[PDB]
Amino acid sequence: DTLERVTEIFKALGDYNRIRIMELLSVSEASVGHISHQLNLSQSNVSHQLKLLKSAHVVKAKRQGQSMIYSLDDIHVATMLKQAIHHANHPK
């Protein structure tokens, strides 16, 4: 089950726009409106992707005022992404 859950985590990340969303969130937590604005994605699209990411426990949301603010779920997720980005960058 552990490895099946890990599989689900990686499957959730296997998408360019979701990676763009994750990366933006690694810079700062954000509302849907802000994510859409920053990434030139529609709010309906962003909401759909976040639902998917949230189901896979890679992003979380908290309520500020009456708005949901999204962030990477926790440090493990942040570390996974930062290490992956770095890995993609260095010479092979």
Cβ-contact 60, 22 below 8 angstroms: no
Residue 60, number of CB atoms within 10 A of its CB = 17
Compare residues 48 and 82 and give the one whose CB is closer to Cl ion.
48
* Contacts to its own copies from residues 7-26, by CB under 8 A: 7, 9-11, 13-16, 19-20, 23
- Distance CA(15)–CA(21), nearest Å, equals 10
62 makes contact with its own copies (CB under 8 A):
no
Pick between residue 42 and residue 83 the one whose CB is nearest to Cl ion: 42
**Shortest reach from residue 19's CB to Zn ion, in Å:** 17
